[PDB]
Coordinates of C-alpha atoms and ligand atoms in Angstrom, one line a residue:
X7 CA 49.1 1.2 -41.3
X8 CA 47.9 5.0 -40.7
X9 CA 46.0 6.4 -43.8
X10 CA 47.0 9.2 -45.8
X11 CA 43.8 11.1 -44.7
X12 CA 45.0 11.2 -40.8
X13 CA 48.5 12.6 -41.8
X14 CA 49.3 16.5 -42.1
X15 CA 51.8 17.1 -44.6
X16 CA 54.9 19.5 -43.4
X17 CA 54.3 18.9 -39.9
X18 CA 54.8 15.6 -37.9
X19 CA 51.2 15.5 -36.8
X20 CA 48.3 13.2 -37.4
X21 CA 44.1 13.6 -36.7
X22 CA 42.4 11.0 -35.1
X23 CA 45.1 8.2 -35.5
X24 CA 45.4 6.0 -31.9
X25 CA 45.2 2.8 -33.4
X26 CA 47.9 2.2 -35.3
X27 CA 50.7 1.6 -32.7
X28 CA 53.8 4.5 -32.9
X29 CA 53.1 6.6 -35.8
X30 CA 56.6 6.7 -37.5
X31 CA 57.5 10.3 -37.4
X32 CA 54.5 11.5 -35.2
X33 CA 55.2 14.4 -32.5
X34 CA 52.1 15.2 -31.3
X35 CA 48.6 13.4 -31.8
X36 CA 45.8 16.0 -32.3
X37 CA 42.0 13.9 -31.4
X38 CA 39.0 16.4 -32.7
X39 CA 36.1 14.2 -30.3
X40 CA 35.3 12.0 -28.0
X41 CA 33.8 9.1 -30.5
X42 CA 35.1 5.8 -30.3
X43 CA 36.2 5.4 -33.8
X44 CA 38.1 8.5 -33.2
X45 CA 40.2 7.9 -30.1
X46 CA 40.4 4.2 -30.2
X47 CA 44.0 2.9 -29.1
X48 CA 44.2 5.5 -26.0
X49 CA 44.3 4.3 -22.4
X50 CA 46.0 5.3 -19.6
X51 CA 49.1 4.0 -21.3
X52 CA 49.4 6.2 -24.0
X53 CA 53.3 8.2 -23.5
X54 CA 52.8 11.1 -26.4
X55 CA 51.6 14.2 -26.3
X56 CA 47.9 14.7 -27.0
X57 CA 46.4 17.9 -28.0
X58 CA 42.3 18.2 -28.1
X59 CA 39.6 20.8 -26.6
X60 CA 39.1 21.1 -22.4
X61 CA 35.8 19.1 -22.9
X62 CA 38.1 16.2 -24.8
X63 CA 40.7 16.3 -22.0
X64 CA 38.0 15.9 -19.3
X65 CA 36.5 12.9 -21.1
X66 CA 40.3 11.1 -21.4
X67 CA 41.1 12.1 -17.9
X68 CA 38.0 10.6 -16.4
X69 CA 37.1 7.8 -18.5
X70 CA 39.9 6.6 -20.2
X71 CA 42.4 7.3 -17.4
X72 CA 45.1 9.3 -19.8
X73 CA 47.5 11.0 -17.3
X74 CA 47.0 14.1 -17.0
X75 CA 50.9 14.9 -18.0
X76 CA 49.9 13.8 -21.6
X77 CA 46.7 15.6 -22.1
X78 CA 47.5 18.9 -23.6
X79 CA 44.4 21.1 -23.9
X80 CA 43.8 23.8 -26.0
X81 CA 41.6 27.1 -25.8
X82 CA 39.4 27.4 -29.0
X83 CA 39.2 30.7 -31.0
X84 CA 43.1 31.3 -30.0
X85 CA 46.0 31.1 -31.7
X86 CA 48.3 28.9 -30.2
X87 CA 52.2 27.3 -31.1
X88 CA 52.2 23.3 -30.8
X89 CA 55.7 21.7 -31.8
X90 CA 56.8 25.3 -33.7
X91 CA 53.6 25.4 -35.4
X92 CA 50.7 28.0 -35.6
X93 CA 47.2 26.1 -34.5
X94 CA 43.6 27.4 -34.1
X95 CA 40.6 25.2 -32.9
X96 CA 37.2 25.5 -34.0
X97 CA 34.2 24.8 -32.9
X98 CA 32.7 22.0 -35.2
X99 CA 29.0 21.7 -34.2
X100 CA 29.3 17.5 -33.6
X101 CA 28.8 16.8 -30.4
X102 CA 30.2 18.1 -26.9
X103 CA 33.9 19.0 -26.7
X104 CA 34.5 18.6 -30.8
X105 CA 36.8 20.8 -33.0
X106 CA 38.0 21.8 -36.4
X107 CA 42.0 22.7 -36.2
X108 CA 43.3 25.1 -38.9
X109 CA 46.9 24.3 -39.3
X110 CA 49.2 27.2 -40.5
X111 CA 52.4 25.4 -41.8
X112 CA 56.1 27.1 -42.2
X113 CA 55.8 26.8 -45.2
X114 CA 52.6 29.4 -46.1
X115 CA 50.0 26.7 -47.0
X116 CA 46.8 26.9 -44.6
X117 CA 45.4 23.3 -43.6
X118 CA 41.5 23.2 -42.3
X119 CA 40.9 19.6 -40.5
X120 CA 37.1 19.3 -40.1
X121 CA 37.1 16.0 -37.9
X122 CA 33.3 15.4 -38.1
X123 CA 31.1 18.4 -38.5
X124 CA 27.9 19.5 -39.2
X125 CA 28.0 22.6 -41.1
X126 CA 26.3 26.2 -40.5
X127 CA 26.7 29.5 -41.7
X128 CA 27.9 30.7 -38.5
X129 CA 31.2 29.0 -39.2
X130 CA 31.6 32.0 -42.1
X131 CA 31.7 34.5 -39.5
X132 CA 34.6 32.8 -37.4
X133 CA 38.9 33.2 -37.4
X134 CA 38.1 31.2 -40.9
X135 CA 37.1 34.6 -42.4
X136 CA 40.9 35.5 -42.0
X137 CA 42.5 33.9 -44.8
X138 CA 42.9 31.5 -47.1
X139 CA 42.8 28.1 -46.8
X140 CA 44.3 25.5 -49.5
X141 CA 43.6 21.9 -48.5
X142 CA 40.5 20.9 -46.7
X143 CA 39.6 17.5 -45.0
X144 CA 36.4 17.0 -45.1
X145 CA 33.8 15.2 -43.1
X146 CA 32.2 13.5 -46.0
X147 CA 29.6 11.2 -43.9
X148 CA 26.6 12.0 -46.3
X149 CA 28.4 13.6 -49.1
X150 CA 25.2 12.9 -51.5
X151 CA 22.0 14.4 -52.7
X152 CA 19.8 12.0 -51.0
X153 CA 20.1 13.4 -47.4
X154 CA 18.3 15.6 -46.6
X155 CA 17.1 16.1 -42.7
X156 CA 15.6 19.2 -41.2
X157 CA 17.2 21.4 -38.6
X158 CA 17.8 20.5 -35.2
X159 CA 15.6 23.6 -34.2
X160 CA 12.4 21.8 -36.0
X161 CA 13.9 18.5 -34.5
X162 CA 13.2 19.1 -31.3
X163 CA 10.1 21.3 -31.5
X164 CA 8.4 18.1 -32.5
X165 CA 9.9 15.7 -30.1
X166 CA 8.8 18.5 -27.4
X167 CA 5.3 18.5 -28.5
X168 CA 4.9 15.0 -29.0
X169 CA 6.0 14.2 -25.2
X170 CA 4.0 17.1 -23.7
X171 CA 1.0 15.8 -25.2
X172 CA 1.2 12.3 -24.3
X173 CA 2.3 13.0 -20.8
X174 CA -0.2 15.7 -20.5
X175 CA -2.9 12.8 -21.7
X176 CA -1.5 10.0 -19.6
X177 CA 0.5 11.0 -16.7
X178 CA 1.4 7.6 -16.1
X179 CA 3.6 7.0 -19.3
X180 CA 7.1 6.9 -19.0
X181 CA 9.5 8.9 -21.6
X182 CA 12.5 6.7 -22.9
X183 CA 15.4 8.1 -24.6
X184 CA 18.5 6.1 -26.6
X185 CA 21.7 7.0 -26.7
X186 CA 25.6 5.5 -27.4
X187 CA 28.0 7.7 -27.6
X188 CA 27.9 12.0 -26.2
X189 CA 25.8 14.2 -28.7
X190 CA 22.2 14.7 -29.4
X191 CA 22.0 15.6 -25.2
X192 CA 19.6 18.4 -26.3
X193 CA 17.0 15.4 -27.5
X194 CA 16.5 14.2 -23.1
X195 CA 17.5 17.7 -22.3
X196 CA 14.4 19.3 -24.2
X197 CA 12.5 16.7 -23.3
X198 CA 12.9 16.8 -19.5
X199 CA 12.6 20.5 -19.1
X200 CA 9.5 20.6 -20.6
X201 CA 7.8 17.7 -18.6
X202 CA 9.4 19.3 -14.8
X203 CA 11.5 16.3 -14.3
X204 CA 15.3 15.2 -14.1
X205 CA 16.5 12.8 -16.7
X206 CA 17.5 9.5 -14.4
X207 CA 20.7 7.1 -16.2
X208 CA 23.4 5.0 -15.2
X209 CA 26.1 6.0 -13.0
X210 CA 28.7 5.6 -15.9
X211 CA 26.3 8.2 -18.4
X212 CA 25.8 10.4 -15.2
X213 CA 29.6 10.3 -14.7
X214 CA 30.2 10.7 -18.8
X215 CA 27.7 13.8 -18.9
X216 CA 29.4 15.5 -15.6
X217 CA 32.5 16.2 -17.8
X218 CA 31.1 18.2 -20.4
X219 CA 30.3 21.7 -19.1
X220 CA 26.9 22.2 -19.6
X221 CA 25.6 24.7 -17.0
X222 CA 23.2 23.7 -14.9
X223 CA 23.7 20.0 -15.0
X224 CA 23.3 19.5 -11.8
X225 CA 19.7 20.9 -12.2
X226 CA 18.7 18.5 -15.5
X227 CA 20.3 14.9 -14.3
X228 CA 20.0 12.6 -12.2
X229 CA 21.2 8.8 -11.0
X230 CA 17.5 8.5 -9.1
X231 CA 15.3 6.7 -11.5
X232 CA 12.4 6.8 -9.2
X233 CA 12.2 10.4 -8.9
X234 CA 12.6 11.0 -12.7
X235 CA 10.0 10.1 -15.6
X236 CA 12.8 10.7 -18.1
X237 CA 14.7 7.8 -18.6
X238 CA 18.0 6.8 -20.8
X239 CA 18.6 4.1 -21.7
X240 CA 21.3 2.3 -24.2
X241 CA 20.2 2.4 -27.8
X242 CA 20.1 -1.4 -27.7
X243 CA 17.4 -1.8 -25.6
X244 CA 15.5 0.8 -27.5
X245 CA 13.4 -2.1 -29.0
X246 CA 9.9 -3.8 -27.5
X247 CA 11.3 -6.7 -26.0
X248 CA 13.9 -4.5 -24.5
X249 CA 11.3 -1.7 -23.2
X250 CA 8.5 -4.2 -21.9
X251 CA 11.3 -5.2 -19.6
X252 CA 12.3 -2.0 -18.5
X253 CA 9.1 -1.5 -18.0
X254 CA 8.4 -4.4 -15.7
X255 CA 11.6 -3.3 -13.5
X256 CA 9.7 0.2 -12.8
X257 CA 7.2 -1.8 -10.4
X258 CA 3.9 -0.5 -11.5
X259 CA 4.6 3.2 -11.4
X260 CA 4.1 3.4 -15.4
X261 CA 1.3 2.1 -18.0
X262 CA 2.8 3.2 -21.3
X263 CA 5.8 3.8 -22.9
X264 CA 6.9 6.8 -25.6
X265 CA 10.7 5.8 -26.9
X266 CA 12.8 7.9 -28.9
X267 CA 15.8 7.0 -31.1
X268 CA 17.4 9.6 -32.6
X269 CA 19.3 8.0 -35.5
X270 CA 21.2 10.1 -38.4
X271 CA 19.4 9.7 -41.4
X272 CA 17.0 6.8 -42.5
X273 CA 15.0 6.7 -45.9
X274 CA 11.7 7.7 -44.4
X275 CA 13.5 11.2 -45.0
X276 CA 13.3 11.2 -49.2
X277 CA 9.6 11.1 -48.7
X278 CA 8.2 12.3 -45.3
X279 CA 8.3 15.7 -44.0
X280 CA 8.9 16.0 -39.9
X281 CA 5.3 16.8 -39.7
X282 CA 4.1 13.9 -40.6
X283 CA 6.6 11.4 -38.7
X284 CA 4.9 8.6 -36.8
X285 CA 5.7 5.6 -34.4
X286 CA 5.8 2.1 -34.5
X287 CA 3.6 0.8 -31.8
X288 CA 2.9 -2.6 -30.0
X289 CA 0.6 -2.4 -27.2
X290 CA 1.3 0.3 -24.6
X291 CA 4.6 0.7 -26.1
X292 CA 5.2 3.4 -29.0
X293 CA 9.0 4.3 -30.4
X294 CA 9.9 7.5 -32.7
X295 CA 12.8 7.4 -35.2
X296 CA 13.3 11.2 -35.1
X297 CA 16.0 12.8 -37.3
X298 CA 18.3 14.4 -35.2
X299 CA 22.0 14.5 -37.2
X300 CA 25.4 15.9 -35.8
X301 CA 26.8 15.9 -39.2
X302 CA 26.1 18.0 -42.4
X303 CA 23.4 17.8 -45.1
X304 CA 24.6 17.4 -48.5
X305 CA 23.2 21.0 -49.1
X306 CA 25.1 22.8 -46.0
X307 CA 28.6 20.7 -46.8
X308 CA 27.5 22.0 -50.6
X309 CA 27.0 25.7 -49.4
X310 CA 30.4 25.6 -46.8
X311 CA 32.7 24.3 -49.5
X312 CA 31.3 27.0 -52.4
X313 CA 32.0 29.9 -49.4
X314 CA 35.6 28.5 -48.3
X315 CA 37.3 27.7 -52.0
X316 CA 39.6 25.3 -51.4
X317 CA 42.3 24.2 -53.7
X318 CA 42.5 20.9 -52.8
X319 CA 40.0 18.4 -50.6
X320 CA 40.5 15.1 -49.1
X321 CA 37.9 13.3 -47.9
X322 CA 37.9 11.5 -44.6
X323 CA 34.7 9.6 -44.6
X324 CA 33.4 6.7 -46.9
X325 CA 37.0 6.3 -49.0
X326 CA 36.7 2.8 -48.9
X327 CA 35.2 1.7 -51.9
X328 CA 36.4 3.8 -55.3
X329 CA 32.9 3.6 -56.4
X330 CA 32.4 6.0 -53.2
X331 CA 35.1 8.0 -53.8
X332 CA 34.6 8.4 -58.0
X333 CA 30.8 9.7 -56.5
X334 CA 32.4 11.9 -54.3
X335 CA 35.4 13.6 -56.8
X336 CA 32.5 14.2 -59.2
X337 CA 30.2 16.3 -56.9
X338 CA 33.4 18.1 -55.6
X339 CA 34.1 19.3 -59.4
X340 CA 30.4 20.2 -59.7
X341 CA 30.8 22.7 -56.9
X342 CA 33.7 24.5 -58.4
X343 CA 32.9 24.7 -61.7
X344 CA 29.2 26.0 -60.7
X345 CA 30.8 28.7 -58.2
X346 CA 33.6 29.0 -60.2
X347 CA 36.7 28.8 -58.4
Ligands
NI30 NI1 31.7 11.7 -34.5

């Protein structure tokens, strides 16, 4: 059955919750992304209303066949009236097309929704400066002192580098990127630019990445592999048995492989700085772990919580397991009593 967490109190709305068959009591289904554990359950048989950003709608329209009589799309930074109700959308810094909604119910309580989110302090400066807000729900992904990662600026400097210099050295190697999901686009994107080449993928990722309104797409993409020495590929094949025979289908063009997987965060990060990252290599093929997160550090969810005050939060992320949530009730009192709200 659907979870507290995806329900909003006062209103008959839920966040994120497809899956569960006819919500009892649900007017209109509000989706903050396009990731599958987010919008799975929708098809082009779906008969309520969904509300979401113009990048969301484009995605449901085009890949999921939702009719377009359905999909409700909303302007962000703009106060708008769903169902009687005052809504704002946000953006989230996740990946393409993803929101936070502030909910402002009848009642005078203000509701922020998160859906996932990577915190910055440019969110401090935006509509959420306005007023209050009294119950947060929280992306909690890596609610925990442990992760750390750097910034995406640093992020990307280094995966730059790294693939000018080894195309520079060997102008036969061949760049490979991983990917599952939209997000982390600036990881090929970067990578391409500086190397004067397209990034060559599948027609489906081609036809994924056209819905996203990134200008100059046109310029940075392409469904020619031949003429690219960017390639994407899914993130299961990102492995050496999977490259060596990607390499083999590129007929001789290519001597060496560089890979790249950007993951979220993996224990190498506790110890190594991005500096000192480095490959695992077998033969003429090399692949980098790099990274490259779309969701908070425990110190920017820290620092956006101590700013905003909430009243109340509910976590939406690892509430499985009450050794989990105990962890995560504990940290949230730590924050309030050191900033003392
Ligand atoms: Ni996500």
């Amino acid at each position: 059955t659907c979870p507290f967490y995806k329900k909003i109190p006062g209103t008959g709305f839920t966040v994120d919750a497809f899956q569960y068959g006819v919500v009892e009591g649900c007017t209109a289904y509000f989706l903050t992304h396009f990731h599958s554990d987010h919008y799975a359950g929708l098809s082009k048989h779906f008969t309520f209303p969904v509300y979401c950003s113009e990048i969301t709608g484009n995605l449901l329209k085009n890949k999921l066949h939702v009719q377009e009589q359905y999909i409700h799309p909303l302007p962000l930074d703009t106060e708008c009236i769903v169902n009687g109700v005052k809504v704002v959308l946000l953006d989230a810094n996740h990946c393409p097309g993803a929101v936070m909604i502030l909910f402002y119910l009848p009642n005078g309580t203000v509701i922020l929704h998160t859906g996932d989110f990577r915190a910055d302090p440019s969110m401090e400066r935006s509509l959420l400066a306005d007023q209050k807000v009294h119950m947060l729900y929280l992306d909690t992904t890596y609610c925990s002192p442990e992760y750390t990662f750097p910034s995406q600026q640093e992020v990307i400097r280094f995966a730059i580098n790294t693939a000018f210099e080894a195309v520079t050295l060997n102008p036969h190697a061949l760049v490979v990127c991983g990917t599952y999901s939209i997000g982390k686009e600036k990881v090929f994107l970067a990578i391409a630019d500086v190397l004067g080449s397209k990034v060559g993928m599948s027609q489906e990722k081609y036809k994924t990445l056209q819905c996203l309104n990134i200008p100059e797409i046109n310029s940075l993409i392409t469904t020619d592999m031949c003429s690219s020495l960017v390639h994407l590929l899914p993130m299961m094949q990102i492995n050496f048995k999977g490259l060596q025979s990607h390499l083999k289908k590129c007929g001789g063009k290519y001597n060496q492989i560089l890979a790249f997987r950007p993951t979220g965060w993996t224990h190498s990060n506790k110890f190594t700085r991005i500096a000192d990252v480095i490959p695992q290599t077998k033969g003429n093929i090399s692949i980098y772990g790099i990274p490259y997160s779309e969701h908070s550090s425990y110190l920017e969810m820290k620092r956006f919580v101590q700013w905003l005050k909430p009243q109340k939060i509910i976590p939406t992320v690892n509430v499985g397991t009450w050794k989990s949530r105990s962890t995560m009730e504990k940290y949230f009192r730590e924050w309030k009593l050191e900033a003392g709200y």
